[PDB]
C-alpha cells in the first residue's frame, strides 16, 4: 500500500486510469480533425486551429488525471491510444457532430466515475471531478451545439459559402 493512500478504492483507481485513456483518445481524435481541415483540399484553417487547441486541452485533462492518481497513491497504468474512428471528417458540420458526440461520451464517463466515487464515499474524487471536469464539459458541449445550430442555419453541408462564412466569423481567426 502507498504510504499516502487513504480512502481510495481500487475500483476508483482503475476507473481513473480508464478515464486517462479516454481523454488521450479524445485528444487524438481532435488532432485528426486538425490535420483534416489543414488539407489543401479542405483549407478551413480557423476550424483546423479550433480542433488543434481542443486536442491540446484533452491532453491536459489526461495529464491532470495522472497527477491525481499519484496524489492519491494510485498507480498510473497506460494502455494503447486507439486511432480515431475516421480518417477523414467530411466537412465542418460532420466534424462538429462527431465532436459533440465525443464530448458527450467523455461526459458520460466522467458522470459514471462520479457515481462510482459517490458509491465508494470518496468526496475528494467527487470534488475533483466537479471542480475540474464537469463544468468544462457542459461548457464545451454547449459551444459545439451552438456551432452545429449555426452550421445548419448556414446551409451545411451543401452551402459552401456558408461554410466559408462560419470559418471566418465563428471560430477565433
Among residues 91, 87, 117, the alpha carbon closest in space to that of 9 is found at 117
Q: How far is CA 91 from CA 27, 77, 151, in A?
A: 19, 36, 10
Close Cβ partners of 47 (under 8 Å, ≥ 6 residues apart)? 37, 92, 95, 166, 167, 171
Smallest gap from Cβ 12 to a second copy, in A, equals: 14
Shortest Å distance, C-beta 158 to Mg ion: 19
Q: Residues near 139 by Cβ (< 8 Å), separated by ≥ 6?
A: none
Residue 3 interacting with Cl ion (CB under 5 A): no
Query: Using CB under 5 A, which of the segments 8-16, 60-68, 94-102, 160-168 binds Mg ion?
Result: 8-16
Q: Are 49 and 30 in contact (CB under 8 A)?
A: no
Task: Provide the minimum distance between the beta carbon of 86 and a second copy in the complex, in angstroms, as a whole number.
Answer: 10
Q: How far is Cα 145 from Cα 101, in angstroms, rounded to an integer?
A: 10
If one asks whether residue 58 binds Fe ion (CB under 5 A), the answer comes out as yes
Regarding 46 and contact with a second copy (CB under 8 A), the answer is: no
Binding mask 131-160 for Mg ion (x = CB under 5 A): ----x-------------------------
User: Binding residues for Cl ion, per CB under 5 A?
Assistant: 5, 7-10, 14-15, 17, 43, 77, 79-80, 85-88, 98, 101-102, 105, 111-113, 116, 121, 123, 135-136, 146, 150, 170
Amino acid at each position: 500500500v502507498s504510504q499516502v493512500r487513504q480512502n481510495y478504492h481500487s475500483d476508483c483507481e482503475a476507473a481513473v486510469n480508464r478515464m486517462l485513456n479516454l481523454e488521450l483518445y479524445a485528444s487524438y481524435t481532435y488532432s485528426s480533425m486538425y490535420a483534416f481541415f489543414d488539407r489543401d483540399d479542405v483549407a478551413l484553417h480557423n476550424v483546423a486551429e479550433f480542433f488543434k487547441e481542443h486536442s491540446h486541452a484533452e491532453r491536459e485533462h489526461a495529464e491532470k488525471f495522472m497527477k491525481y492518481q499519484n496524489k492519491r497513491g494510485g498507480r498510473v497504468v497506460l494502455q494503447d491510444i486507439k486511432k480515431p474512428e475516421r480518417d477523414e471528417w467530411g466537412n465542418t458540420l460532420e466534424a462538429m457532430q462527431a465532436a459533440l458526440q465525443l464530448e458527450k461520451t467523455v461526459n458520460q464517463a466522467l458522470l459514471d466515475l462520479h457515481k462510482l466515487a459517490t458509491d465508494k464515499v470518496d468526496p475528494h474524487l467527487c470534488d475533483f471531478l466537479e471542480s475540474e471536469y464537469l463544468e468544462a464539459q457542459v461548457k464545451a458541449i454547449k459551444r459545439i451545439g451552438d456551432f452545429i445550430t449555426n452550421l445548419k442555419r448556414l446551409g451545411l453541408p451543401e452551402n459552401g459559402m456558408g461554410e466559408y462564412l462560419f470559418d471566418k466569423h465563428s471560430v477565433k481567426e
